[PDB]
Design a protein around this ligand. Structure first.
Ligand SMILES: CCCCCCCCCCCCCCCCCC(=O)OC[C@H](COP(=O)([O-])OCC(O)COP(=O)([O-])OC[C@@H](COC(=O)CCCCCCCCCCCCCCCCC)OC(=O)CCCCCCCCCCCCCCCCC)OC(=O)CCCCCCCCCCCCCCCCC
Ligand SMILES: CCCCCCCCCCCCCCCCCC(=O)OC[C@H](COP(=O)([O-])OCC(O)COP(=O)([O-])OC[C@@H](COC(=O)CCCCCCCCCCCCCCCCC)OC(=O)CCCCCCCCCCCCCCCCC)OC(=O)CCCCCCCCCCCCCCCCC
Ligand SMILES: CCCCCCCCCCCCCCCCCC(=O)O[C@@H](COC(=O)CCCCCCCCCCCCCCC)COP(=O)(O)OCC[N+](C)(C)C
Ligand SMILES: CCCCCCCCCCCCCCCCCC(=O)O[C@@H](COC(=O)CCCCCCCCCCCCCCC)COP(=O)(O)OCC[N+](C)(C)C
Ligand SMILES: CCCCCCCCCCCCCCCCCC(=O)O[C@@H](COC(=O)CCCCCCCCCCCCCCC)COP(=O)(O)OC[C@H](O)CO
Ligand SMILES: CCCCCCCCCCCCCCCCCC(=O)O[C@@H](COC(=O)CCCCCCCCCCCCCCC)COP(=O)(O)OC[C@H](O)CO
Ligand SMILES: CCCCCCCCCCCCCCCCCCCC(=O)O[C@H](COC(=O)CCCCCCCCCCCCCC)COP(=O)(O)OCCN
Ligand SMILES: CCCCCCCCCCCCCCCCCCCC(=O)O[C@H](COC(=O)CCCCCCCCCCCCCC)COP(=O)(O)OCCN
Ligand SMILES: CCCCCCCCCCCCCCCCCCCC(=O)O[C@H](COC(=O)CCCCCCCCCCCCCC)COP(=O)(O)OCCN
Ligand SMILES: CCCCCCCCCCCCCCCCCC(=O)OC[C@H](COP(=O)(O)O)OC(=O)CCCCCCCCCCCCCCCCC
Lengths: 546, 108, 125, 117, 443, 64
């Protein structure tokens, strides 16, 4: 059962993209994709119960040695331990519902089986990433999900902005991939191996944690790397759900939790600044998918700070990752159903009422939104409150500012999520297209993720749930009051007259515009210099006329 | 509506035929004159080099500047490698007689 | 709805600029710059001077509290010491520079453990 | 200030474009359409208070000030219907143009299908 | 040796076939390059990997011309014998067949020679053939042919007196006795650097490549990119490092800064290119700069990693030249502005273009990924910053690669129809070699 | 021109001269880029300087 969680989504992708799919068509390829995900989810459930609960890790030599020159030895080997089982359960369970949704959402697309094969490849490379036992097979998974993210973001290739969004995701992540590669070189040079179980670091040379942190900041879309994440909304809604829940953005946090070789000052500062920035960014957007994208960036900031706190903080970071994937995928699927019910419009000024959506879509948005804002005794309450209480008792003075930033971020999140519900359903109608979707497949796709939200409350992620870190009632129940403050403010729909702050925040602090000329235009101009002045000029040798 | 094959294979050239045969040049592009002119100009851009102010300044600060930066970095890396390996100062090109090539029979 | 109408982009009918490869013409109207916001009007008509001027205040407004707590506040602000361990368990736990147990000011080797948690970059020889 | 296109317009069309863009920017800055209706009424009453003017200098001063206001309050995220330029559904799955086909190209003039030298 | 004489004499019989038998001429010239591929595969079978460094030796008396096999020469010979029948599939005249047959004889004998004067005689005897191949009258460029021939001649003329200097110094040009005698290493080191820094494109003596590799036909571009640049690398590994090692240590800051500026400036120039063949042509300079610095590091397993990068480049860049050659053959242009939407009109060709784009950018499951990792291990072990320079500049390679792919493959569908059976089978051996060498290269 | 009344016409042209950046702007932004993207080089140079000045202090106060 253990190799069935990794191979078999890759097999589904291989089937649906090869000339076998010429004989199946759309109708047969949908069956193949859904079955190939159901099998992998069943295998991951067995792996989860064996490794997490009964504590028996399994190591598999899959395809022998990859390459071995000198003392640099990379093998095709997996290891299934606690983190790997957690990640496999989360990835396969989310990707199954996203496949069941995409087989109905992209029904009218002309190349449906190609899209399903790309989704399966993306899932399989994520499984390869988390199942690897050494750094090089991890890099296979890293670049595989990067390539499949490029193929899926720029799926509608006749649209130029989608193509440029895919290229932007590739380039922004390529900077951090370079830094991560140099960090792998440092790690191997000063420890002698590439396998995770032999990488126990107490005191290393600083470049190790910094360069691995930069490589993780690329994929997890932290500060000065978040710019690709918002533009990745050019792709279809299943792509966004799988990018923001289970694949891609959770890979850097997984890598930092696995290695635990960071220096906590950088991690805490980057995470808290990212959380506050993405909180204020999502409060001032009107595109329905961009608000959810910025909430993803904000929660990744929370997890970054938590893994900065310590080993218990690393466990809480993995726990928040696991519970975040379910309600984030549910939020994106419900938003896709609302968009399709309103004629493709993504602006929240053109919604309202309870006619453009099913009852189940509204229930899904409500329950996932309540889990995200930390409503008591739902799924996100346990993990988010654990991170907040662990940040309130850290003995680092830097974590004092980080906790304040997290509390402000919590109020902002409960503001804009309540605004997303309020604009979508509570206000009067201001669109003109009412085509509500009530198909069986997307409704069952949403119901599965709501079942996982219930499961996280009933069965915890780890042993931290129910442990009491001893805090006064004032410190403990303040995030509930911040949630209520966000709800009351957003339902009052109040606004400020400070329009220059509004347009500074709504334009997202001008990061893209400043990047358009601080590295980008200089790279183009230095290329002009090296070609025209150097190759055609200073180094050019002419002819002798006679 | 040309016929370039007999019913049993056997390609026919159609040299004297009225209908236009499909062949290798069927999908050759129709040339835009301005695109051809721009590509010709970029192909011969060495005729446009001139030693004005901007050319001289950018060729000094970027080309010579980064070449000197890379030479300084290479010498820095060489010296630091020799220090972290237990070697004395070693003779690079133009550096007076010194040690080159460590002996394998020696412990450094 | 596949097959929606879309307007085509015209071909060049005038002499081209020398550095024409900064426009992305994919065949449909409109084309775009090679990188967005490199030229043309920015969204909301803002400029680079606008963002640099607002950031010259806003950046120190965000870097101010971290500096204050990192230079004017220490471990003794906490109402309790870090989590206590037996010596055989503690002695390996505080070998990590990453650990939050080096902020235990009641430990007998508090200074020596803090002096061993200084970050270095070049490994010496 | 207006763009070079709007500055070339006749005076009637210049004022009409200013009123139209003001209504659209009020749509962009509002939360809903039901928020937008009384702001649209207020903008209409604002234009009605300058209808009976004759002095071209006062007309020019009011026109230029309003164009400065519209350049100031240009929304960074305008509301565009999805199937139009700048919308989210523009240029996704267009019908293919007619592409020509060459049947059995390898079988035409075999043994002579390389590059000349 | 007797086998090599038989293969040469069988290959030279193409001229005696009467030209009116077209099928026979095609089949004979294709089989004349198929047979050496089988013979070199057999030589790989015969090789003892736990034996001596030099195996299958032969020396022809007092005429120089001594031959032997090591691992680098054997891998490069296998790559050349793969690449030459693909070139045979892209030619149509007996003049082309004979030029490529003579080029194959000279390349194969130059790759495994053990005499410096023999290397000089065998390699640049191909100069006039390259001049005629590049400056062909209706569709070539005489300017490019003049540039490549004059740069190569300049470097070779710098080497030739230093070759003769060590020959008078010790009494032989055999590399086994040149490595064991006392010689004036600065002079000979400068001569060897002069040839091999022109063969490998190293700045500033690199301007011949953008003209020659574009003005060449598709077969000429496949040969020039995949094979002839690596003669500089095997020159470094076979002749210069064993015979003048004191020079090779003392020149390391200069060779290091030449490699760094070649990598950075050639990557910066590749971004402003508007010709697809010129885009593919520039990208080879940065890869060869990484090869040269990995050779000169001499640090962990430097010969292994640098040879593996030479093989990975020699597999991936000829395929990109093949795809550009298909586009040029059936659309009569190489200009980016004339191509858009090639995914809808050539789905198989665009898929092959994407896979080889990913391979050229050293993504995993391609041999370039393993190659660049091991080359940076060899570079890192001297100093960490010399590795950091190559690591942080990976966004600059991906920028031009994905920009060229996205400009020509997506958008409005215009351009030629998809590949034929012949074009697919020109591409196909390189793809199989890439999948094998990127997944299970060793056992 | 069959869709110009639906999506707009080609009359409005792009306002850009396709000219290189100013020399001082290019120099300043390149220097900032070198400082940001090559910060390990400056970190290691500072390490070498801080190490050699300590050995200077040792060699100064030792021989007295
Ligand atoms: C987040 C959204 C981003 C964009 C919105 C900007 C909001 C900033 C602001 O100050 O708005 C207050 C703003 C008041 O502005 P205003 O109503 O236009 O001006 C006040 C009246 O003219 C007249 O009001 P008043 O004189 O009766 O007093 C109201 C005001 C004081 O008004 C004054 O007279 C200002 C004097 C300053 C010192 C007092 O009181 C305060 O703001 C005191 C602190 C509470 O509050 C609102 O009405 C909007 C509420 C929406 C949520 C904001 C709640 C605070 C959120 C905290 C996190 C901050 C995140 C932003 C990061 C910055 C980058
Ligand atoms: C005796 C030389 C014979 C061998 C070369 C040959 O046949 O050249 C004919 C050919 C004669 O062409 P031309 O139509 O009379 O034009 C003369 C230059 O373009 C003159 O154009 P220019 O006004 O740009 O020349 C000033 C020249 C500054 O000239 C120099 O740097 C002369 C110093 C050379 C002494 C060596 C140290 O600066 C450069 O061109 C770039 C710096 C050269 C390094 O010379 C060249 O192609 C230029 C020679 C430059 C040598 C450096 C090449 C860099 C690689
Ligand atoms: C400097 C070492 C040589 C390494 C060069 C890199 C080779 C590139 C690919 C890596 C393959 C590794 C193969 C390892 C086992 C094969 C046999 C072997 O041992 O290798 C030989 C040589 O290996 C080769 O020749 C490998 C051939 C690789 C070339 C592959 C490219 C050509 C194929 C093109 C695609 C064909 C597809 C056709 C199908 C349609 C000798 O090398 P060493 O073990 O270092 O020699 C030992 C040294 N001593 C005797 C002193 C003790
Ligand atoms: C022909 C008779 C004279 C040949 C003398 C050559 C002396 C050196 C001249 C420069 C080197 C050119 C070598 C090119 C070889 C490849 C080639 O193209 O071969 C020729 C023929 O080349 C040969 O002579 C091949 C046999 C000699 C080499 C092999 C045997 C000895 C080893 C093929 O025929 P075409 O080019 O169609 O001949 C037409 C002639 N013309 C260009 C003038 C329009
Ligand atoms: C072991 C795995 C083996 C394969 C398992 C996967 C195959 C089941 C899904 C079959 C393809 C889905 C598409 C499909 O069947 O579409 C229909 C949806 O069919 C369904 O009712 C839903 C599919 C079955 C339930 C979901 C099965 C997926 C497996 C996960 C189950 C988790 C619980 C369309 O509606 P209808 O045909 O019922 O109605 C016709 C229409 O009204 C008139 O034109
Ligand atoms: C002037 C002539 C033209 C230029 C000079 C060409 C010189 C001959 C080519 C290189 C000869 C050595 C081949 C490499 C090798 O390892 O050969 C050995 C192994 O033999 C082989 O398997 C040779 C394979 C030949 C083909 C492989 C490629 C090498 C060069 C190719 C030349 C022909 C290519 C034709 C292309 C159309 C030697 O075998 P032997 O029995 O003679 O030696 C053993 C002992 O010492 C007794 O002397
Ligand atoms: C264009 C990009 C496309 C991307 C494609 C997907 C991503 C791929 C990424 C990784 C690729 C690795 C592929 C390796 C191929 C084989 C390498 C091993 C060769 C070999 O002889 O090994 C034996 C083969 O075993 C076996 O192979 C098992 C025996 C047969 C039983 C299972 C059959 C396979 C079913 C797979 C279903 C589909 C999965 C899709 C990946 C195993 O033994 P060893 O010698 O290594 O000994 C050690 C343990 N005994
Ligand atoms: C009307 C606006 C007032 C805002 C405050 C929220 C309501 C709190 C009422 C109050 O005075 O409660 C105090 C809470 O203060 C404290 O000691 C806690 C301060 C921080 C609480 C913030 C979160 C409130 C919960 C939502 C006393 O607390 P008590 O003596 O009743 O407490 C022990 C019994 N559980
Ligand atoms: C010396 C080494 C220098 C390292 C940095 C080099 C960065 C070079 C970027 C070259 C970009 C050329 C290709 C290009 O313009 O593509 C755009 C990518 O933008 C971008 O790549 C924009 C983002 C640039 C951020 C670079 C640094 C990120 C990390 C900060 C530290 C398209 O995308 P688009 O911008 O038009 O997107 C539109 C979606 N809306
Ligand atoms: C390619 C570009 C790659 C570089 C990208 C950005 C890297 C920025 C690096 C900035 C600092 C570099 C290191 C400098 C400080 C360390 C110092 O190490 O010691 C230097 C180094 C080390 O001294 P030592 O360790 O005490 O021996 O000093 C030297 O020996 C070199 C001194 C002279 C350097 C310039 C020589 C003139 C070259 C002119 C080249 C122009 C040709 C134009 C032709 C056209």
């Amino acid at each position: 059962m253990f190799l069935l969680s990794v191979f078999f989504p890759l097999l589904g992708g291989l089937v649906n993209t090869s000339p076998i799919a010429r004989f199946l068509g759309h109708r047969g390829s949908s069956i193949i994709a859904i079955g190939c995900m159901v099998v992998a989810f069943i295998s991951s459930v067995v792996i989860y119960y064996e490794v997490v609960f009964m504590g028996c890790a399994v190591s598999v030599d899959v395809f022998g040695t990859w390459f071995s020159v000198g003392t640099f030895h990379a093998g095709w080997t997996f290891n299934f331990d606690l983190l790997t089982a957690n990640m496999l359960f989360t990835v396969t369970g989310v990707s199954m519902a996203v496949h069941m949704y995409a087989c109905d959402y992209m029904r009218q697309d002309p190349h449906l089986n190609l899209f399903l094969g790309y989704l399966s490849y993306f899932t399989g490379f994520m499984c390869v990433l988390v199942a690897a036992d050494n750094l090089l097979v991890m890099l296979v998974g890293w670049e595989g999900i990067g390539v499949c993210s490029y193929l899926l973001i720029g799926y509608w290739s006749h649209r130029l902005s989608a193509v440029k969004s895919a290229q932007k995701a590739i380039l922004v992540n390529r900077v951090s991939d370079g830094l991560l590669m140099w960090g792998v070189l440092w790690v191997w040079y000063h420890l002698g191996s590439l396998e995770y179980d032999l990488l126990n670091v107490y005191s290393a040379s600083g470049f190790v944690g910094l360069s691995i942190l930069i490589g993780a900041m690329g994929k997890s879309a932290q500060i000065l790397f978040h710019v690709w994440l918002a533009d990745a909304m050019e792709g279809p809604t299943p792509v966004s759900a799988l990018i923001h829940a289970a694949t891609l953005v959770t890979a850097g946090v997984y890598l930092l939790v696995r290695l635990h070789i960071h220096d906590e000052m950088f991690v805490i500062i980057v995470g808290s600044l990212t959380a506050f920035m993405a909180g204020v960014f999502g409060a001032t957007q009107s595109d329905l998918k961009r608000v959810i994208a910025y909430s993803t960036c904000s929660q990744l900031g929370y997890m970054m700070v938590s893994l900065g706190l310590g080993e218990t903080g690393g466990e809480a970071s993995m726990g928040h990752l696991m519970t975040h994937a379910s309600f984030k995928a549910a939020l994106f699927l419900a938003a896709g159903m609302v968009i399709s019910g309103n004629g493709g419009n993504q602006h929240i000024a053109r919604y309202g009422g309870s006619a453009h959506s099913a009852m189940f879509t509204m229930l899904t948005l409500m329950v996932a939104s309540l889990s995200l804002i930390g409503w008591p005794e739902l799924s996100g309450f346990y993990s988010k409150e654990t991170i907040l209480n662990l940040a309130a008792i850290c003995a680092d003075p830097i974590a004092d500012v980080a906790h304040t930033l997290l509390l402000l971020t919590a109020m902002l999140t409960s503001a804009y999520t309540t605004k997303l519900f309020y604009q979508c359903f509570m206000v009067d109608f201001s669109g003109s297209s009412v085509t509500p979707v009530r198909n069986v497949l997307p409704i069952l796709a949403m119901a599965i993720l709501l079942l996982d939200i219930m499961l996280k409350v009933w069965v915890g992620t780890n042993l931290l749930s129910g442990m009491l870190f001893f805090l006064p009632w004032g410190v403990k129940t303040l995030p509930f009051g911040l949630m209520v403050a966000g709800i009351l403010t957003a339902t009052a729909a109040v606004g400020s007259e400070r329009f220059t702050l509004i347009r500074f925040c709504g334009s997202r602090w001008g990061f893209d515009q400043l990047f358009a000329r601080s590295p980008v235009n200089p790279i183009f101009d230095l290329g002009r210099i090296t070609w025209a002045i150097g190759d055609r000029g200073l180094l050019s040798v002419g002819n002798l006329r006679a | 509506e040309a016929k370039q094959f007999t019913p049993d294979g056997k390609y026919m050239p159609g040299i004297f035929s009225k209908a236009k045969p499909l062949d290798r040049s069927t999908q050759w592009v129709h040339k835009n004159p301005y695109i051809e002119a721009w590509y010709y100009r970029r192909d011969h851009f060495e005729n446009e080099f001139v030693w004005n102010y901007r050319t001289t300044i950018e060729a000094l600060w970027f080309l010579g500047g980064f070449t000197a930066a890379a030479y300084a970095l290479s010498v820095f890396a060489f010296r630091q490698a020799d220090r972290r390996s237990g070697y004395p100062k070693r003779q690079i090109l133009g550096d007076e007689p010194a040690m080159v090539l460590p002996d394998e029979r020696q412990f450094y | 709805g596949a097959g929606a109408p879309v307007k085509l982009a015209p071909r060049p009918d005038k002499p081209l600029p020398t550095w024409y490869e900064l426009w992305w013409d994919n065949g449909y109207y409109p084309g775009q710059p090679a990188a967005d916001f490199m030229f043309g009007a920015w969204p909301g008509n803002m400029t680079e001077t606008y963002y640099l001027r607002f950031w010259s205040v806003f950046g120190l407004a965000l870097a101010a509290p971290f500096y204050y707590v990192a230079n004017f506040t220490d471990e003794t602000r906490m109402p309790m010491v870090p989590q206590q361990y037996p010596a055989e368990v503690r002695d390996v736990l505080v070998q990590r520079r990453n650990s939050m147990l080096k902020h235990d000011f009641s430990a007998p080797d508090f200074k020596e453990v803090k002096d061993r948690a200084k970050i270095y970059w070049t490994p010496m020889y | 200030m207006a763009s070079e296109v709007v500055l070339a317009l006749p005076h009637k069309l210049r004022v009409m474009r200013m009123y139209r863009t003001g209504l659209k920017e009020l749509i962009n800055w509002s939360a809903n359409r039901h928020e937008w209706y009384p702001r649209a009424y207020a903008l209409r009453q604002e234009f009605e208070d300058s209808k009976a003017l004759t002095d071209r200098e006062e007309i020019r001063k009011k026109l230029e000030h309003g164009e400065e206001l519209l350049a100031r309050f240009r929304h960074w995220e305008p509301l565009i219907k999805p199937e139009f330029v700048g919308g989210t559904a523009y240029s996704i799955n267009p019908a293919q143009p007619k592409l020509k086909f060459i049947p059995n190209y390898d079988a035409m003039d075999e043994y002579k299908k390389g590059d000349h030298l | 040796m007797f086998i090599s004489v038989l293969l040469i004499l069988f290959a030279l019989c193409v001229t005696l076939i009467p030209e009116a038998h077209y099928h026979m001429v095609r089949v004979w010239s294709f089989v004349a390059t198929i047979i050496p591929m089988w013979v070199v595969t057999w030589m790989w079978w015969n090789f003892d990997a736990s034996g001596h460094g030099l195996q299958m030796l032969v020396i022809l008396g007092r005429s120089h011309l001594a031959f032997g096999i090591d691992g680098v020469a054997l891998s490069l010979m296998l790559l050349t014998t793969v690449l030459f029948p693909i070139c045979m599939m892209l030619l149509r005249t007996v003049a082309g067949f004979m030029t490529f047959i003579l080029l194959e004889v000279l390349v194969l004998s130059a790759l495994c020679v053990l005499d410096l004067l023999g290397f000089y005689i065998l390699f640049e005897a191909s100069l006039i053939l390259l001049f005629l191949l590049i400056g062909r009258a209706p569709y070539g460029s005489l300017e490019a042919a003049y540039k490549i021939v004059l740069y190569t001649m300049a470097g070779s003329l710098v080497l030739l007196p230093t070759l003769f200097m060590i020959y008078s110094e010790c009494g032989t040009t055999n590399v086994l006795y040149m490595t064991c005698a006392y010689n004036h290493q600065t002079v000979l080191g400068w001569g060897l650097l002069a040839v091999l820094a022109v063969k490998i494109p190293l700045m500033p003596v690199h301007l011949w490549l953008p003209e020659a590799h574009v003005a060449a036909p598709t077969a000429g571009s496949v040969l020039l990119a995949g094979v002839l640049l690596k003669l500089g690398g095997i020159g470094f590994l076979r002749f210069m490092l064993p015979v003048v090692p004191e020079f090779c240590v003392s020149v390391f800051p200069l060779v290091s800064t030449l490699c760094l500026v070649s990598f950075l400036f050639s990557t910066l120039s590749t971004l402003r290119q508007i010709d697809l063949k010129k885009i593919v042509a520039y990208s080879s300079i940065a890869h060869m700069s990484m090869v040269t610095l990995a050779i000169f590091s001499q640090s962990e397993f430097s010969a292994y990693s640098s040879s593996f990068l030479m093989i990975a480049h020699g597999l991936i860049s000829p395929a990109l030249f093949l795809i550009v050659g298909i586009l040029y053959d059936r659309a009569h242009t190489k200009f980016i502005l004339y191509f858009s939407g090639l995914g809808a009109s050539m789905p198989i060709g665009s898929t092959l273009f994407f896979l080889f784009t990913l391979g050229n950018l050293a993504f995993p499951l391609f041999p370039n990924f393993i190659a660049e990792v091991l080359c940076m291990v060899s570079i890192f072990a001297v100093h960490e910053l010399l590795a950091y320079v190559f690591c942080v500049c990976q966004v600059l390679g991906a920028a031009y690669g994905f920009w060229a792919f996205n400009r020509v493959v997506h958008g409005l569908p215009r351009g030629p129809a998809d590949v034929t059976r012949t074009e697919f089978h020109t591409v196909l051996p390189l793809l199989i070699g890439a999948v094998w060498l990127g997944i299970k290269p060793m056992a | 021109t069959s869709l110009d009344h639906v999506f707009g016409d080609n009359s409005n042209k792009l306002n850009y001269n396709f000219e290189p950046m100013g020399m001082g702007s290019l120099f300043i932004r390149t220097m900032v880029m070198v400082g940001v993207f090559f910060f390990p080089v400056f970190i290691m140079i500072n390490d070498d300087y801080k190490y050699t000045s300590f050995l200077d202090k040792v060699a100064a106060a030792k021989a007295a």
